[PDB]
Amino acid sequence: GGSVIVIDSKAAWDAQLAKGKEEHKPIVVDFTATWCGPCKMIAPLFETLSNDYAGKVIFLKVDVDAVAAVAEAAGITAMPTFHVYKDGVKADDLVGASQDKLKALVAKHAAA
């Protein structure tokens, strides 16, 4: 929902990472699963933040069931896991469903 872009393939993943690098905009990614309780608790905030920061931060969703190869390359072991990507590469991460920590992560990387 919101301004979150759902990733459906490795090809789409690569293309979004490439666009964030060209646009010089940070990317925040939610690695998630619909069987995971904490994922369901935090997804509304991820969506709201995607609206609030639309234009400053790009928001992607990777369902680990839908794109296991992208989940594997990201080294995920618990969910939700949030990654920040800048200039094509992982810059930061945050594991778990803390609302304050997710807000702080987006603000940190949106201030540039």
Residue numbers in the entry: 1 to 112
Text lifted from the article:
Thioredoxins (TRXs) are small oxidoreductases that contribute, in most living organisms, to the control of cellular redox homeostasis. Indeed, they reduce disulfide bonds on numerous proteins involved in several processes, including antioxidant defense mechanisms, photosynthetic carbon metabolism, and protein folding. In addition, TRXs have been suggested to control two additional Cys-based post-translational modifications, namely S-glutathionylation and S-nitrosylation, by catalyzing the reduction of glutathione-mixed disulfides (–SSGs) and S-nitrosothiols (–SNOs), respectively. The redox activity of TRXs relies on the presence of two Cys residues in the conserved Trp-Cys-(Gly/Pro)-Pro-Cys (WC(G/P)PC) active site motif.
In the present study, we deepen the structural features of CrTRXh1, providing the 3D structures of both the reduced form and variants in which catalytic cysteines were mutated. Structural alignments and circular dichroism (CD) analysis of reduced and oxidized CrTRXh1 reveal an identical folding independent on the redox state. The analysis of the catalytic site microenvironment from the crystal structure of reduced CrTRXh1 indicates that a hydrogen-bonding network is the major factor determining CysN reactivity. Through mass spectrometry (MS) analysis coupled to pH-dependent iodoacetamide (IAM)-based alkylation, we experimentally determined the pKa of both active site cysteines.
